[PDB]
């Protein structure tokens, strides 16, 4: 009952619409983030989801109190009875403030007046990806946030601990199936808007796309399709149906594997590195079918070897057997080196 | 007005938190439904939507009024001011009342204290479909509802004489099911908190096989007939025989896959999966039959249709 | 301040819970609909979405006023303070009353007490469809609405203008992709329920499906598959692999086409018109395969014609070349005349 | 100084009637509007709508909210908006929309000394845009946002773009994965309904479709499968199995591409540009199959070689001419 | 507008015998059809509002029914007071009344 | 008991206008629309137009468009029909009907024979 | 009796401070938690979570809610819960959870004479579960539900299982479409964050995958494709059309099966056990195609001996691969 009397003494005449030090000073909102889990990244929608304990600390001289306890951990509900920063995420597409069983917020009021206001959030933030070297791509996905209504003359956001120190990440808190969180770089900028100039706290999370998935699903099938096409080079000259079905099936496979590779991608006209690799594999299979057509043009006996003139083994096919694999190998070396070495 | 003063007196000093006759005797509540339309049964999620006018009646001794007015018919605005039983549907995965244009809730109070409380509910109820004989499977889907907090000693439910007013079944959205029968029951379930009275509406529904006969069984059967066509083809036509066999086996696998996507991820073999597997055996055996022939055909021509029809008879009987 | 005083007098002693003229008369509600945009018709769920300005007008002697203005135009916040009809759609299913920016509802109180209460609604109403004639079907999708708690002796509904002129559809509101809104016809009836007799206003929107999409998606591919089955007739009999691939291809293609036709429809236990069309087309292609088998039985010589005996062109093939196109054309004429000519 | 501001604000909200608009019973209130587009992502043809995120700001003069004692602009908490009259603005195309709520309700209220009120909302709205897909993917879609006052006629409210073409910003910096905003126009209208005449603002984006993607995924596979069908002309006529295999598989593969692509689009009745090009490619491959059937009927009915040679060069020529006429129509 | 046609322009029915009238509408009028009685040199008197419903204070013998377009009015037994001209009007669209039928002896 | 009282028969020559009134007493005038009908001797009843008494919104028949002017008096609670450019074809008997709702005309006027020659 | 109960509940809620926990400033309040799991709707490996429906009950002692006049347990209606202090319990794994609300909020309050409050909720939780699919589908995943207090440290609130193993019930009757709950384990710990130390209850379900579904769906199709690919070894070498068609069909079918199953699973970068099996089957079918290519290059570019050794080698070494695979995984 003592703390009830204290609480009602620090809420009577407390207008929660007004800022701390409004008309007298700026409010330094010392912000911290604890990433409980870095949610999955949706490349199709160029956004990522992140679960965070978003901690805000600010000094509110109206709420300074003198009592037996030096800190009051109060129920989440009281958070709605006092002023809080109107923090919002500049790239937040659709964020959720969890409230089960009850609103997941905490409000610790320190004796001097400092408020430690924290809340669990799931934030779906927009990360504009430049997919040109995809899948060997690295993205510095930002997480920008700041006051929605208050100018820099009204609210300024700072980091309590200091850059990098402030934004922590749980050791097991990583739901990145296909990315790897290399790290984060905390920054702070001032953005101009139609209504004023706003301080924006940015934290770029550096994500490295693990290529194992796309290797298994695209590159190995495509390479094996190319090798399937060159199996036709080792097939017989005089077997027209067999090498025909071989070539047409491999070309059809590459059509389906290009469209299938592009369903996972977002619909962007960048012609990603996967598109370049698929295009060259397409060129190889199509050139294999063209080579078979070229050899079939000069097929004259039209009878395969038995045991009565027989078609001699094609010189073109003999040269193809060695040239096509070697050129495709050096293609692979050049492409892999170029994309792996670059950032 | 007269009605306003009567209703004001009814709510004056009314404790909404306390049930009628709390600590005196159980409150007897009679429940009568009117099913607007059973919605689509989602076998993948093992749930079925149902729309109902759920009406429950109870005697409240605080809501008796003597006057020329025999009944007060009121809108949903009253519902929040009086005690309503905390009825919840045990097998409800998700549910929501209807709020357009206004809350779809009716309240009616008789002079003798009786209260009729009705509301329109779309309930996505859970029904555990045992899909062992699917699509020849009959399901008795329940709709359990009980007080969440008031034990058997405080709230009791007994079906009213008009227990369920089954609607016109023709307008019902049952595409694969046919409403076979209405059953109902009341029981007592012992929970950790206490004993609770549970009333379950058993809707007995039988699935119709016509859609699946044309959607699944007929295509598969025709594919088996295509495999049979291989026997009449000359054996010397190796590309033709091989192409027909491999095409039939491959497309059978594709049909099985797409069928398995439309079904739940159940850890057993459904009837549908059993019949596509037996069709797989037939077409694959045709492929191996040609393999043996190259390395008999006349006997196959007669044997295969006879075995398939025998399996069909055993299957339909089962 | 004067208008605020008037509104205070209107709500002073007003009883939200009692309908107008309780214990004196039936409350007549004159209703209107301005379909802002006839939203997409979802055949899979046998429901249609419609966006409407749903107007209601009723006389409430309690809300009579005398002031400088004859019609008080007011926002939604006043509406919650007054009695409004508890209208609901008997076949409604998960409607939404729009809230952005504010609750999209107007209220206008005329000095005689007449109210004009309009709201913008997106209503997904159930439309039971008999798809026997699908895709040539025409559907009279209803929109039944009425009071939930008030019987005919309590609340009666009416059309504010002539019944023909009381449901107005905007010129540019047609959001129908595969439907053509021919018009609407309205009626008023009574429904018997366990609680009493209820007045129900019904309006049937007469929709005619546009067959173009299914012409391009289903009918043309089916016809082309049939013709692809008949090119096998024109081909020589000795090319057993060629005609075998042709016929098996046509049958499998018609199988996937049939499945693609069904999954585009809500599940039903009866066969639609397109199901019959596909069944006859499947009969044609399967008959082509059976015909190929029949001629293959009589193919005495395996070797093809060269410019030694030679196989004669099959008689069955020659008769098929004319019969199959003639039977298929006669069937198409009969089918299209049967369904298109129907009202 | 905070006490003075507190007393001033409480004075403003004391006696304020949220039911009445500014100058109720007087001339219409002029409500200016400015928009900062944050994204126009997810333009959906299947749903015939586009999801647009914006900082919808509307400014209006409310004599009741005028104060002279404080010389700075009072930015109040978002929760005060519920205590103030706000225009009943709605988007007639809005299928589904929401104001962002994290960490708090993303609204803005900024009372200026002269009485002006700057009401800002961070709104995500899935607006309806009926797309004439006859030229798709070579189309330019005139999608719009129809901002209108619901209950207040033109005799009670007035709209205007605050700043003419500078009232809308952020449009040039929008990166759409499948579009380019070639132009946007700002229109002011007065729309008459049965209820009355209302003021209307229309923000119309002429969104031009980026063809490069559709060339990558749709056109080149079709062309390559047509060239693949042309490969049949270089195979000897005696190879029935090979040539029919090629022509069949290519006709089937183009029919399947047609059906899958049309599945990704709404069930529209009219032929689209993609449909016209795919049908032309289908006709070319089907005529190649019928070309083999012609040389097979003639051989099995020197001359046979003539049709092969003629078609070998004529088919590329006629297909290129088809491309030229097609692109000229659609480019 | 909507055209209303009454087939038996004139028929004679013996006193006490059942007599049935008919009224046709050009197109849909729903249930919005009313039957009125006009005695010589008197204004019309409503008999059957809606397709079936009967107005208050009317003898029970009068009774009618109809579909969307066709309509019929039947008198269980003609009486001396029942001799008059019977009109059918529609209110689905702007009013348009029918030719009318006259009964004698 | 609602009773629609119309004016008595009028005698007039062609080419001049006439005014026929319709007075209602039982029900409140503004609540329901007032319709005017004309039945030519030995012919079907013919609708001429109706007026919403409260706001005087009026709608006429295409055949009678511009020939008849409908007005109302709230204070007198009376509906007036003004006929202009009379001709011999106009000779008929007028009634005024009360539309209770869009199902029936509840009461009718006594009838005002119009004579022109 | 009515008046007395009403007076007593009025006395309890009179002056009650919802903001302060029981014994605020005193020792921690001990909250016992009991759970009755009604159903586990699904286990979405795609989204790395499971949907669980449960009767979550928490009981705790509040001296302010102790009554003595009436000797019975007042089971008040649910809406009184919003007027009482309840633990601010949350779930760490919770991505999307909701308390049901038909016909009312599915919730229970029951005050006992001693002050004990029994608080029940019906909750459906989509709890995150990061699965380790290296052994998939032979995998056992211990998906967890981490119940934790948000604002109150161990100095303010304490959790426990009322009944160390009887506090969780109904697990045995749970029906999972593709899992079988082998075990459930209840543990309690303390977790330290930068804001302080908090109590934590952890309910762990050791779900074991039901292999039968994946036998029908994944392993049997792969086995049948490989077995049918072995049919090529019995066909004569001078059937190149049929041999190559059979082999290419096998390789293509395994390619489609691999891509299809990987589309039904999340885009993981590590090779699963199903991936090891599919790669082995891929190697076998692809080596069958290369086996025919080698036969061809030896005869055209002895043969019967190579086919003869293939016929026995491939099934034998594939069976040994199967045995090694199972013993590594199933055993
Ligand atoms: C697209 C890939 C192919 C494009 C290459 C396009 C280049 C191109 O068109 O090749 C022409 C020629 C074709 O030779 P071809 O493949 O037909 O092989 C022999 C050649 O035609 C002889 O002239 C024939 O003997 P003859 O004298 O008639 O009696 C002999 O038949 P036979 O007498 O024994 O019965 C044939 O088998 O090959 C080259 O000159 C080397 C090119 C190596 C090309 C390799 C580069 C990869
Ligand atoms: C699935 O993973 C969870 C991860 O939380 C496992 O929970 C852990 O289970 C172990 C074994 O019961 C716990 O160990 C305990 O340690 C204390 C000392 O701190 C000891 O006194 C206990 O007797 C017990 O051995 C551990 O605390 C617990 N929580 C963790 C690791 O965070 C769970 O066990 C796993 N599933 C199964 C079926 O084990
Ligand atoms: C719902 O259940 C009850 C019983 O469970 C049915 O009504 C009772 O039926 C028994 C058996 O004939 C009678 O002895 C009781 O007297 C009945 N109750 C009453 C109040 O009369 C009821 O018919 C069931 N509903 C159905 C079948 O629709
Ligand atoms: C002379 C010739 O080249 C022959 C070879 C292939 C033949 C066509 C096959 C498909 C047929 C479908 C329908 O039966 C209508 C006639 C149809 C178009 C045929 C016309 C004559 C053709 C072109
Ligand atoms: C000698 C022999 O029997 C022949 C039969 C089949 C041939 C292989 C086909 C696929 C090729 C893909 C790449 O281009 C590298 C060479 C590659 C592996 C070839 C090696 C030699 C083989 C085994």
Residue numbers in the entry:
A (entry chain A): 37 to 343, 419 to 454
B (entry chain D): 25 to 319, 410 to 432
C (entry chain C): 12 to 318, 383 to 418
D (entry chain B): 8 to 308, 458 to 487
E (entry chain K): 1 to 105
F (entry chain J): 1 to 52, 52A, 53 to 82, 82A, 82B, 82C, 83 to 100, 100A, ...
G (entry chain E): 8 to 308, 459 to 488
The authors write:
Type A γ-aminobutyric acid receptors (GABAARs) are the principal inhibitory receptors in the brain and the target of a wide range of clinical agents, including anaesthetics, sedatives, hypnotics and antidepressants. Here, we isolate native murine GABAAR assemblies containing the widely expressed α1 subunit and elucidate their structures in complex with drugs used to treat insomnia (zolpidem (ZOL) and flurazepam) and postpartum depression (the neurosteroid allopregnanolone (APG)). Using cryo-electron microscopy (cryo-EM) analysis and single-molecule photobleaching experiments, we uncover three major structural populations in the brain: the canonical α1β2γ2 receptor containing two α1 subunits, and two assemblies containing one α1 and either an α2 or α3 subunit, in which the single α1-containing receptors feature a more compact arrangement between the transmembrane and extracellular domains. In all three classes from all three datasets we observed two α subunits, two β subunits and one γ subunit arranged in an α*-β-α-β*-γ clockwise order when viewed from the extracellular side of the membrane (asterisks denote subunits adjacent to the γ subunit).
In the APG/GABA dataset, 3D reconstructions at resolutions of 2.5 Å, 2.6 Å and 2.6 Å were achieved for the two-Fab, ortho-one-Fab and meta-one-Fab assemblies, respectively. We used the two-Fab and ortho-one-Fab structures from the APG/GABA dataset as models to compare interdomain arrangements in receptors containing one or two α1 subunits. Despite containing homologous subunits, in which there are 80%/75% amino acid sequence identities between α1 and α2/3 subunits, respectively, we observed conformational differences between the two-Fab and one-Fab complexes. However, when aligned by the TMD, the r.m.s.d. of the ECD increases to 1.05 Å, suggesting notable interdomain displacement between these α1 and α2/3 subunits. Furthermore, both meta-one-Fab and ortho-one-Fab exhibit markedly ‘shorter’ separations between the ECD and TMD centre of masses than the two-Fab complexes, which is also apparent as a reduction of angles between the primary axes of the ECDs and the TMDs in one-Fab receptors.
